[PDB]
Amino acid sequence: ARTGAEYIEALKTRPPNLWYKGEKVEDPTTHPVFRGIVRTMAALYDLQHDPRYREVLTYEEEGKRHGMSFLIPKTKEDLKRRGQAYKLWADQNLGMMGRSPDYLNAVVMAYAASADYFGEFAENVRNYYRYLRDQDLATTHALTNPQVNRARPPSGQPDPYIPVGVVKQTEKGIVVRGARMTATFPLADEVLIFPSTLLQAGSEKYALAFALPTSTPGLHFVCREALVGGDSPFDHPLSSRVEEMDCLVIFDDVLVPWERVFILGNVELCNNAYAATGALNHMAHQVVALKTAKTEAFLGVAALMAEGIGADVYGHVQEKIAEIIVYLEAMRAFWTRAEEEAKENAYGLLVPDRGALDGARNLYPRLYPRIREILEQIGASGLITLPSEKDFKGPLGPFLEKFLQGAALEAKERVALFRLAWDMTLSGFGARQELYERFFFGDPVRMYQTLYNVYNKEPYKERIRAFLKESLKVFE
Amino acid sequence: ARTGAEYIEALKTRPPNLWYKGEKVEDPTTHPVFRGIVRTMAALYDLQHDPRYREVLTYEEEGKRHGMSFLIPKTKEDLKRRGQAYKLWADQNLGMMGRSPDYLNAVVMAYAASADYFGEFAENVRNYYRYLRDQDLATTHALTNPQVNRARPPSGQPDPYIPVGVVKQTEKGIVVRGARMTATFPLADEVLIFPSTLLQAGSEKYALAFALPTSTPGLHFVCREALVGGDSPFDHPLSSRVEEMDCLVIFDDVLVPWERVFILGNVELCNNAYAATGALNHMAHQVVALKTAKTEAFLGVAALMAEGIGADVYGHVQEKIAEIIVYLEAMRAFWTRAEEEAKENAYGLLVPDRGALDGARNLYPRLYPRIREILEQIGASGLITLPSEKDFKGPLGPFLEKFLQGAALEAKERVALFRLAWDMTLSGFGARQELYERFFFGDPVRMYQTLYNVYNKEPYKERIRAFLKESLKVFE
Amino acid sequence: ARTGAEYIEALKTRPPNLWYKGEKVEDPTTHPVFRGIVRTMAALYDLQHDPRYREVLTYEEEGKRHGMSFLIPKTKEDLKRRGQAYKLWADQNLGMMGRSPDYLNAVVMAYAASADYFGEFAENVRNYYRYLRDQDLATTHALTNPQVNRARPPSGQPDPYIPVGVVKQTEKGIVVRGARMTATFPLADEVLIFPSTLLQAGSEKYALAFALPTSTPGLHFVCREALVGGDSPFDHPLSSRVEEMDCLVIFDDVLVPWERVFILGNVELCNNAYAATGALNHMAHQVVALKTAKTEAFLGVAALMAEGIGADVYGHVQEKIAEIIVYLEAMRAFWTRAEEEAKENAYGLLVPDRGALDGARNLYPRLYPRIREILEQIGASGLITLPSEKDFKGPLGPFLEKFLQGAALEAKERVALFRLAWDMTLSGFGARQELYERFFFGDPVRMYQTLYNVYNKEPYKERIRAFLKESLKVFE
Amino acid sequence: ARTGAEYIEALKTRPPNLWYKGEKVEDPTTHPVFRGIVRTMAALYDLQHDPRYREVLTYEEEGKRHGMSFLIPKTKEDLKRRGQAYKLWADQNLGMMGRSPDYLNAVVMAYAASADYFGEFAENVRNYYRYLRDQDLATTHALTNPQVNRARPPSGQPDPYIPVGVVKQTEKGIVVRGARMTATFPLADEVLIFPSTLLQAGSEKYALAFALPTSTPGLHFVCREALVGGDSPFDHPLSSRVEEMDCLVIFDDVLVPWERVFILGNVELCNNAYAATGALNHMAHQVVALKTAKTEAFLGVAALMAEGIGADVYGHVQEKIAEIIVYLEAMRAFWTRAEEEAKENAYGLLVPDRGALDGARNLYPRLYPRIREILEQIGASGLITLPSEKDFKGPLGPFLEKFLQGAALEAKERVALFRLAWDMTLSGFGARQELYERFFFGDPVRMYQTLYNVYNKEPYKERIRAFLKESLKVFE
Numbered sequence A, B, C, D: 001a002r003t004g005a006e007y008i009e010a011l012k013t014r015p016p017n018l019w020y021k022g023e024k025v026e027d028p029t030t031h032p033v034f035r036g037i038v039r040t041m042a043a044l045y046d047l048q049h050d051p052r053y054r055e056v057l058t059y060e061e062e063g064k065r066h067g068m069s070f071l072i073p074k075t076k077e078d079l080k081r082r083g084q085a086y087k088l089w090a091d092q093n094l095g096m097m098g099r100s101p102d103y104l105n106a107v108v109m110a111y112a113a114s115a116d117y118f119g120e121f122a123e124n125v126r127n128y129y130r131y132l133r134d135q136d137l138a139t140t141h142a143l144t145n146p147q148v149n150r151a152r153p154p155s156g157q158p159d160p161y162i163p164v165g166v167v168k169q170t171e172k173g174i175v176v177r178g179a180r181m182t183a184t185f186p187l188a189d190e191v192l193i194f195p196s197t198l199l200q201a202g203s204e205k206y207a208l209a210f211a212l213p214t215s216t217p218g219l220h221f222v223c224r225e226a227l228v229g230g231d232s233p234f235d236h237p238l239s240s241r242v243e244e245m246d247c248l249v250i251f252d253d254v255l256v257p258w259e260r261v262f263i264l265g266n267v268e269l270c271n272n273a274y275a276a277t278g279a280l281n282h283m284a285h286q287v288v289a290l291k292t293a294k295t296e297a298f299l300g301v302a303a304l305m306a307e308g309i310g311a312d313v314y315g316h317v318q319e320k321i322a323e324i325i326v327y328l329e330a331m332r333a334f335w336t337r338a339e340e341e342a343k344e345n346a347y348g349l350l351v352p353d354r355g356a357l358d359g360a361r362n363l364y365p366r367l368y369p370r371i372r373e374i375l376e377q378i379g380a381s382g383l384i385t386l387p388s389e390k391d392f393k394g395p396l397g398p399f400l401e402k403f404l405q406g407a408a409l410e411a412k413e414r415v416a417l418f419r420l421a422w423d424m425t426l427s428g429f430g431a432r433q434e435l436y437e438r439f440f441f442g443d444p445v446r447m448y449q450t451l452y453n454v455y456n457k458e459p460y461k462e463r464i465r466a467f468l469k470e471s472l473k474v475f476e
């Protein structure tokens, strides 16, 4: 289990090939755009060594201590243990950090437990899992092709190598060229270039699954506009510390060593990877715990805002808060059923129930925009009446303490709260979270079509056919 | 455990004081408006003796066999057993029968297990429970006051006795006068006149809880317009058998024997009855199982309709069906968590988790109208192109077999299916089901306000206050 | 201009070839299922001769009086006159009659004014228009193909003649075989078998447009389940008089005389018929006036229900009623702009603005279900507490007058109102109205795709490109 | 009519008493946070002198040229002229500038035309109007009280002077103390401290209406967190130029000269000010034109994004764009009816129809969040894949030109477009626009309650009562 200091030293020593506004980022641990999230990830690692949480966040094995997200669960109790670790980490950042490493560790853990799925590359998968686990490395990932001409398949873009494709194979490995559209949280040691969780691979040239150090020659991470509002925790309570960053991933004829290849030119293996290995189930397990944490945060802020300005006395405000409570209970329910109905897959890996998790990941993208809307409807103008800590410290401070106090809340506390509510919804950082919730697991349109096609609808159709027997009997 | 024949004989011998269109109903077992639902309830009772389901629907105790809905659960396994019985009964009618007796048995079971709550009337409650159980009697109930002037409390209506109130007390019992607005499924032996599950009692004169035989002198059940479309199972697959009927309940100075009184003039006891006894938890448990069954039925019909007319090839149709699947999984999740997180209440009664059940009963009223809408959007004109079995049997039958066949479905089967879809959504019977789902457990506006006030929001508010400590530290 | 008596005599003398439950309907003017709507249509005709409305509903020309819906408008004032007639007729039935003849007269009027569009069949169109006008005949129509396998085109169904297609041509006319899925209000003298307003014709064999007397040999109208609740105006205020009926239209090798053919085997002419002639604009004009009338009716009922039970004192109830007001104003706005921005088409026919009408017909299908929902949310249990006039006339009448009175409303008036609200939303008749609003003008999915493709989006795209010039200048 | 240079010189010479992060803003024309919007307002003024638009934006009177927003309309044509000016100005900034001066000029124009309403202060109003008109000054306004304890009225806050109240009256004028919660676009010469458009004044101490130079001693504007993303038009196409700024307005015992007082201590006059004068109608007229412009901008961006990435080939994407078209037509319709149904008020001032405008201002707050959502659903990950112009100018430029090109769109143009879409929806600037649309004209909850209470519902209730006469006749 890594400490925060080790993580920081690792990034400083071998930083990811990040680019920000046309320039290479030499040290993300001190760069204004990245130092915040780096400190945040470091704090998550440090929590693993806090006596109060060590038993929750890590497990011992043969004289070593590993992060819980690497635990191959054998019982429902083990599954619950993984869930508690997901939740504890999520709560540290109010569920605002969407790509903490444990999500991807869940994927690799499942891939390893179900390694036989990968055939000749099985050992590579098992060895990679042990590597990430033993070193407790941080990972980032990118599964989608560049958004260029969505009317055509991967092989029908303006160039054969817009998507990441194999240029050639050598005795050392494969050379790939192309790009992945999005990778969140590039402040990692490794990047996972895996198949989509729902879209078809299309052609063998693109049917790939491999991992690389983020400093690999030819590999580039091009950052989007930064959303860090500033460093003041009062003025920017969340963007000052949880801005994970999103980036386009470029592969300029990058060499991928054979030991890092997990799938090569096999469309079928790519198209069934997450479902067959159980990675889909486990990664979605981290997600349901994460969204439960996020919903709890919104509930707390909504309640405090309403009480803070005396709006809680109005029925419709109470109803809006109750709506968030209903959604919170829904997510807790999916989480519980996912663990309680868990069963072993074809490789003997215990996986949480897909029905419950498909329910959660397809319902939350609909619930989140409404939860966000609720905060807007409760806060109203209070959400944009955001003086700075500098204003409270300035000449008009006394006036602000009078005009911005709450029903029974001091002005500084009131503004601190609304600054947080704003950062969770209306700042560039907050608004991005909305788009993130709507799309991170895939396009809802195709996620729903996917659910329709994979779900076993026969039992329900049969019950209706049986009910209709009496209807057709009138013709006998 | 009662048989269907015993139930039918009981209603024929001592029929409820029903009125339909200005006339007394002498025999509901043969009356055109009621014989269908009577046969349906009789079939539910008969199922208790079917070897295939006897172990699911009943339990043995001291040489006797009782209906599962009377079982006082001691373990989570017992809770699961009650749930399986709720589900099996619900599936028989595609979740379209909303007031089967087991819902109210859950209430009385909890009242009895928590009988100490009722003080001096505790024995009356325990004895009544044993009575309903031993005789396996059918019950109906009415908890709301007449909808006259909702701007005023129960004591502020045009007359003191519009709501049911105590006129006087005697050595034999109490005399009550007034009315209850709605009682569904009056084809029962007993009627429960209990407090509201969310509204305050208002005044001691109305703070009551008692039970009476449905044939009691002075007691009248005034039926609304019947929604039975006909007796043909082809033409009216559901309304011909599951029209439970709704009625206004009138009390013309009715005498309630002291042994049938459970609460008298105690506003506090009325206002906390369901929550304190656990009746709220158990009755909501029957509901979540029931709505899961109902959603499964809609999923089956939606899938069959789409496949039937070849609409399943369209993405948005697949998405609509997947939406129903998401809702089905949500209800299954609430159900699972309700049982898995069950704990004993103050009286030692094991009760299913209120959070999960409050989630289910406050979310489904929102989901159902959408599920209904989905069927409409899939079926389109097929939902009103409803020839009768008589048309298929007539001169134009051959033409109908050609023009109303489906992609790979025969015409008679196609129309049988759409007749069912129509009866589940657009017939008078189907449309009522929508209003029922929206309101049966209470007015959503006040159900949400109730949830807001009772829910413990402190943990979430505290997490936010803790997060804001760093914000306020900038002023130190 | 026809009188009601003339209409009734015409149907009695030469009734449409209607079938109900396997039997031919000999006299729809006296048949229990149809006499109500027949009397309603007769009343609309009679209104044309009422001194108070004669100038609104008819116009004089060369010694004759014609129905306003036949007026070929030359000025915006004439357009307004047509609109006022649409509205006056609609108000008679609270906007619940969706297929009154004036909707189709608008179509034929436009077809005639733009007759050159039809080439060699131009004279047939002009003559048919004069025929309908002079005789003031009632029409019904069917534009859709049987819902069998929607995954395939008209030419890909189980049989070439499932859709109406030409079998052969003779010296007398054409022989057609097949069926149309739906025709509402078959209590007419003529039936219009025209092209779709948005779907492609597919093949020349089906590219048709013709009209026939409803008594034509080989032509059959197969009625769906009747939705007439009864004849009591108290118990069934709307279904007793406005049940238009829907039916499948069968063509058993029907001969269509050459003089009744308007389009034959021309896919292009079929695909552009309504837009090119202006029929789309005019028929949608009747619709916007009709939906404005319907919304006014719902507003009135919602307001009366809220006041009736004292629910109007609650904020959210006031908000729901205000929502209906917003929708009413939206429809009035579309109506006004449709007339004020009217311009002449390629044939010199003044047509109301398509933008405003496309807005109205694509927005109302979304607004109506919500308007219906609002009535449900306001009425609650009052919507199913529906005793009959027979109950008020019976022994319990006195009790009902006490328990079902409103805040300041007598019981009989209260129940009459809720019976109406129920008939507008939850009776089989009311529920059908919802499906009708959702689909009558076409499938929303394809109506929206149609709007996207036909709308000129260039002006807006150009404004954005211009705005972006400054963005690209940074690279100069 | 002012030129941009005159406006800039005026702000530089006598700047508003602005505060940003604890410091006074000495020159907003050069300050990084305000120079953008100042240049934007200056450009609006300059447009008044462009030969192409002079006749649209100004009118001549007695040798002078005045801004169109000051024109007292005498005919519907004049009303249309005002509307065209509103639209032309709005289009310059894609409808993103919500508080351009013409909105408030509409208010003052109406106040002046209906000056008799103000009694003894009538001349002050007329003189102030002439002042703003002749000097073509820019105004800002604040109508709401500090959000402190919304459970209590203005007189029930923690201090009597939290809301702006009269401290004392002298021979020179009145001294006021307190604050207004929000004023958008404080880069103005004058500030209007007027009554609410829907909330009651509460007490005479707060029933005020006056105007002051923004440099008045004791008057302070405390700015919220700035949302200017940067100065690059490529990177921040909108926030670099249209960030109007919102601020809390503080009154530290400010002296208001008697000539600047329009209403003093008259609750009734305050509560009916906008409706009686017609200011409500005219200010809402500017709004409907503005929202039409805004919707046109979103339509253009949505269409370009869809075409840009080839997503336009998908049905649901076409449907989403068509949805925006429907909303655009709805707003155009409200606009048209508002002008066409205009009538003179009690003071002889021609005012646009309130029904149409109440419809528009109560419907758009519901439509906008959906329009914003649509852009998110179309753009998906493209909305956060935002490299900078600096990245295109840097070493990886060539790679970006390959991976971020569109179907038939160059990469730089593609990113410029998505940067704009992002700035319109997800940047801090874009997100604020959503909250703005939801609340600028008032809290929807109370706006709807206001509409319910003021609307004449009698005609609709009467039509229903008339329809029910036949129902009650059954008892005769």
Ligand SMILES: Cc1cc2nc3c(=O)[nH]c(=O)nc-3n(C[C@H](O)[C@H](O)[C@H](O)COP(=O)(O)OP(=O)(O)OC[C@H]3O[C@@H](n4cnc5c(N)ncnc54)[C@H](O)[C@@H]3O)c2cc1C
Pocket: A099, A141, A142, A143, A144, A147, A150, A182, A183, A184, A185, A246, A432, A435, A436, A439, A440, A441, A442, A443, A445, A446, D309, D311, D314, D317, D377, D378, D379, D380, D381, D382, D384
């Ligand atoms: C903040 C944020 C963070 C993210 N982080 C990561 C990450 O860490 N790693 C990673 O791999 N991904 C990440 N993503 C990407 C995410 O998984 C994708 O946005 C999502 O899967 C949907 O695909 P897309 O963005 O390519 O949109 P597209 O496929 O480009 O779609 C654009 C639009 O076109 C439509 N359309 C396109 N194709 C079809 C089709 N075939 N059928 C129907 N409609 C179609 C869509 O429905 C939508 O309306 C992130 C996204 C966001 C917004």
Ligand SMILES: Cc1cc2nc3c(=O)[nH]c(=O)nc-3n(C[C@H](O)[C@H](O)[C@H](O)COP(=O)(O)OP(=O)(O)OC[C@H]3O[C@@H](n4cnc5c(N)ncnc54)[C@H](O)[C@@H]3O)c2cc1C
Pocket: B099, B141, B142, B143, B144, B147, B150, B182, B183, B184, B185, B246, B432, B435, B436, B439, B440, B441, B442, B443, B445, B446, C309, C311, C314, C317, C377, C378, C379, C380, C381, C382, C384
């Ligand atoms: C088909 C059907 C079957 C039913 N079966 C049964 C049954 O078997 N047994 C039984 O006891 N009940 C039954 N009911 C009744 C059901 O529980 C009630 O409809 C429900 O609890 C809501 O109360 P209400 O109908 O009295 O409506 P109301 O209280 O009359 O409300 C009407 C409207 O006024 C509003 N309003 C009124 N008061 C307030 C308030 N204080 N605050 C805010 N808004 C207010 C509501 O929000 C709503 O918009 C049934 C109802 C239906 C529709």
Ligand SMILES: O=C(O)Cc1ccc(O)cc1
Pocket: A143, A144, A195, A196, A197, A198, A199, A440, A441, A442
């Ligand atoms: O699978 C996809 O196509 C999108 C996706 C990307 C990252 C992720 O973690 C889940 C889904």
Ligand SMILES: O=C(O)Cc1ccc(O)cc1
Pocket: B143, B144, B195, B196, B197, B198, B199, B440, B441, B442
């Ligand atoms: O509790 C209420 O007031 C309405 C209600 C009625 C019957 C029921 O079973 C549940 C709730």
Ligand SMILES: O=C(O)Cc1ccc(O)cc1
Pocket: D143, D144, D195, D196, D197, D198, D199, D440, D441, D442
């Ligand atoms: O009237 C209000 O109370 C809010 C409001 C504020 C400014 C404005 O322009 C319109 C409404």
